[PDB]
Design a protein around this ligand. Structure first.
Ligand SMILES: Nc1ccc2nc(N)nc(O)c2c1
Ligand SMILES: Nc1ccc2nc(N)nc(O)c2c1
Ligand SMILES: [Zn+2]
Ligand SMILES: [Zn+2]
Lengths: 361, 361
């Protein structure tokens, strides 16, 4: 197995489908990564996450460096062994979630000391497969001046991240490193950022700084010009996106990888994704509904339990309600990704996207 | 399959091992029943409860009549279909948990109107396999006068329960009815109660009114004289017991069936049962312990995850921690029951009980 090989099997417009081969497994793209914040995808055993179709999960340099600790996890054999997930793990770099749960920022990093060097080292200690460069995210809205400052600092930090990763042989040989494009909503800054990142060279390229309050039309407008700026032959990762319709439109714009807490977090709060749009299972109208969460869904939850039962569990505060809702929503997201992949392979993704939107809305 | 057939395969002292055959499955005895209060064994899918070795689970006329409602569950197809457990379910009668979460008691029942007739009807609506007579539990300590009054009322209610069950053909043909001995800690009242219940006739006989604050020596003293009073050829159910050592000693005294919330409830609070006694996984000493919860346990949790990981999850408030702890503890209890059954079958239970106690303590 190679350290890293991204291959594109089929294309339609700007959409692509293919594979990322890594030492710990193959990632089918476009890919959705369930988020495992504190070394768990909330309310799911790893075998259940896998059974839903996930090829890779996300972790975070922030939560884990705080609890249980990066050195501790390394002593215990690494994150994979610790949590019982033996396939690829992408780790975020930790900037984003510092500025989460008395920040002091400087050119050296953030204290709260998380620098580019320490972030890459933590991700090493965790045994991450896909390491994210340490960046500064840029709040929305941002003035051009502030967006430029943040983007420029992130590009200096992208070079520091590259060099920290490459200087550590076991990491450089076994893991991959992704860079993160910044620039807010501004085309010229997005272009400077893409060019800086391509000059350094990375295994993949994330679009950072979106899904921070701008809303879908604007996100899509920025993706329209931003994704083409990135090297075509490397994966394109849209960080922190998103809703099902966000994912479809982002794939239409050349994104290959996604993560978001919506299916887990919103699942525990009672929101179930269906092909006919989201439902909130707490609604009284579900109290005697014997149908599954979604009429077509192949997941184990929909094979076995009714809306009425899940309604009762969520109303009652029961753990099994969180478990069932989360499994269904992660399974739904993976079925979406499978339908996206298949439709691109068959040259009918544009039609799939049309049909999906007509019915989901 | 018969409605009900209890067979004793092997005996040692007062201990017995055998089977209860019912329409929905066979129950191996001595049996431990996980408790499923609000139509769920907390933090476990039913398939997981089964995989641990459980043959039967417990539900409760109280919680379910309140939420989601007995008539509602019947409309939805019964408790088995609702929660996805297709094997036997024993339901408690609801008295106990009323006097749980402005009570008005009378000879007719309790208002808060739960009468013997309504309790048996609710258990019908739920589709219970083993229906408990509606009783009055008697607080501990109890004066002889108050214990006698409560016991006498419970025996009048036991006859009302019998007659309500028998007058409903589908229930009488497909379910079983257990009576509940009362009398507090008093031998003469226990004898009157046993005699009253045997005169009415039941499919099984519970020992009620224990594990309410008296402590193990006293419980065992009362079991010593109380269990022999019950018909030998019917199951003996000790309600709400107990800790592993409580179970062993109760089997030594002729009990065949058990339920308790300890493995579920205490599991979510961090207590793990092991052959070397309970541990509290929240203790800092487990933060880097790579051993499984218990060194011999065959459960899936112990095959896959470390104390260190479960420690982290419970400290972090994570749902997966509750899931793992609960699975392990229910699996532990079922392995205890299997070792009890096998040792009685092989004529070496007294030695097993010795050995168990030496090491657990
Ligand atoms: N919307 C997102 C989510 C995660 C991110 N993480 C990093 N490191 N940088 C960003 O821009 C992110 C944006
Ligand atoms: N310790 C227990 C637990 C459950 C009981 N339920 C009923 N109906 N009656 C009792 O005496 C109980 C005692
Ligand atoms: Zn589903
Ligand atoms: Zn175990």
């Amino acid at each position: 197995r190679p350290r890293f090989s991204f291959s594109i099997a089929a294309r339609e417009g700007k959409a692509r489908t293919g594979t990322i081969e890594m030492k710990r497994g193959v990632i089918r793209t476009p890919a959705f990564m369930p988020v495992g914040t504190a070394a768990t995808v909330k309310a799911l055993k790893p075998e259940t996450v896998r059974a839903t179709g996930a090829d890779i999960i996300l972790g975070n340099t922030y939560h884990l460096m705080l609890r249980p600790g990066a050195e501790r996890i390394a002593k215990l054999g690494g994150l994979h062994s610790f949590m019982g997930w033996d396939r690829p793990i992408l780790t975020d770099s930790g900037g984003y979630q510092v500025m989460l749960s008395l920040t002091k920022q400087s050119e050296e990093g953030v204290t709260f000391m998380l620098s580019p060097e320490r972030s890459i080292e933590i991700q090493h200690l965790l045994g991450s497969d896909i390491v994210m460069a340490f960046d500064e995210c840029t709040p929305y809205p941002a003035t051009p001046s502030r967006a430029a400052s943040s983007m420029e600092r992130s590009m200096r930090w992208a070079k520091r991240s590259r060099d920290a990763f490459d200087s550590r042989k076991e990491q450089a040989e076994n893991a991959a490193l992704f860079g993160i494009q910044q620039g807010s909503v501004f085309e010229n800054l997005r272009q400077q950022s893409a060019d800086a990142l391509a000059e350094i060279g990375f295994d993949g390229y994330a679009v950072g700084g979106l899904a921070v309050g701008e809303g879908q039309d604007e996100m899509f407008r920025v993706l329209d010009f931003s994704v083409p700026m990135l090297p075509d032959d490397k994966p394109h990762y849209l960080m922190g996106v998103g809703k099902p319709d966000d994912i479809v439109g982002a794939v239409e714009r050349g994104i290959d990888m996604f993560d978001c807490v919506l299916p887990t977090r919103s699942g525990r709060n009672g929101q179930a994704f269906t092909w006919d749009g989201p439902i909130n299972i707490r609604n009284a109208r579900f109290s005697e509904d014997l149908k599954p969460l979604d009429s077509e869904c192949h997941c184990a939850v929909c094979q076995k339990w009714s809306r009425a039962y899940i309604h009762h569990l969520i109303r009652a505060g029961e753990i099994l309600g969180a478990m069932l809702m989360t499994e269904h929503n992660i399974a739904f997201y993976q079925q979406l990704m499978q339908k996206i992949r298949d439709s691109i392979s068959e040259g009918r993704f544009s039609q799939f996207a049309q049909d999906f939107r007509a019915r989901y809305f």
